[PDB]
């Protein structure tokens, strides 16, 4: 499993919480492996008497899980960033076994995206304004943000995608993870299984491409094999029409065929959050 994440060590104990003090109310869309609980929380912030977070319950038990559990834990304990999915603890007290992350009400960023963008209408007669360049740098700029926070622990992601941020209380933008994403991969990573803070920087373009395409597919018009022909044969995903030149240099940084020219995190969240300061002059 996290044998990626085996040079990591947290300094910090896991916390525990009380089985009493979490009140399930109903789940948070169709959780795989788990499933995603919306609960009330009890005694966990002094602040707040009762507030609301995320619950993941374990589905098996044998030490195989019980192990993995104990160590998916103890790393989480350790990725505390305002840009990251916020880790409260576990709980123990009988079966099954419960994992408690902050509630980001907006869900993912990708619904979230496709929801504020123009296809909008089209995606949904269902319930029934675009992101501005500013809103969309702000998103941008955010996710850029807990990507040079992961980069500063050693920390490889492997699955940089909008479908893993969550958008939460007035357009806050947070990396997490609900568990191969040929798309997002670079050609070291699709052939030879290598991921680096150099294959999560590619990553980090193709999720700026997902930003300025409001929530399309990489390579839409291609099948899986399709794109991994595309991909390792130097093909560059196409500049998006709400794109300005300016950010579309960024992504074409981050997709430098060699690894070692790709432009580091910290120039990137710097040159966005520049950008997302001054929104540049573009005209479509
Ligand atoms: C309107 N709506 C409809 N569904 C939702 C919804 C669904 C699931 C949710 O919770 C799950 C998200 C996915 N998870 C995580 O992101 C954990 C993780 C953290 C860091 C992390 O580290 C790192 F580095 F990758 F960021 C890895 C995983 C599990 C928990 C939430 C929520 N967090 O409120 C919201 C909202």
Known sequence: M??????????GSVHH??????????????????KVFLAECHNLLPEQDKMLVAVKALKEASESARQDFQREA??????????????????????????????????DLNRFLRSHGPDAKLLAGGEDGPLGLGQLLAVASQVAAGMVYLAGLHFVHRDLATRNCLVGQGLVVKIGDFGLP????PPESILYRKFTTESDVWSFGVVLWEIFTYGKQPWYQLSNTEAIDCITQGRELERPRACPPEVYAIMRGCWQREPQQRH???????????????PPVYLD
């Open 2 to 11: 996290h044998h990626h994440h085996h040079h990591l060590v947290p300094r």
């Open 17 to 34: 919480i009380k089985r009493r003090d979490i009140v399930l109310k109903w789940e948070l869309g169709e959780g795989a492996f788990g």
């Open 74 to 107: 103890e790393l989480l304990t350790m990725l505390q960033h305002q840009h990251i999915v916020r880790f409260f603890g576990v709980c123990t007290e009988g079966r099954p076994l419960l994992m408690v992350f902050e509630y980001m009400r907006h869900g």
């Open 182 to 185: 040929i798309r997002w991969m």
């Open 264 to 278: 580091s995190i910290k120039d990137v969240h710097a040159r966005l959050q520049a950008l997302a300061q001054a």
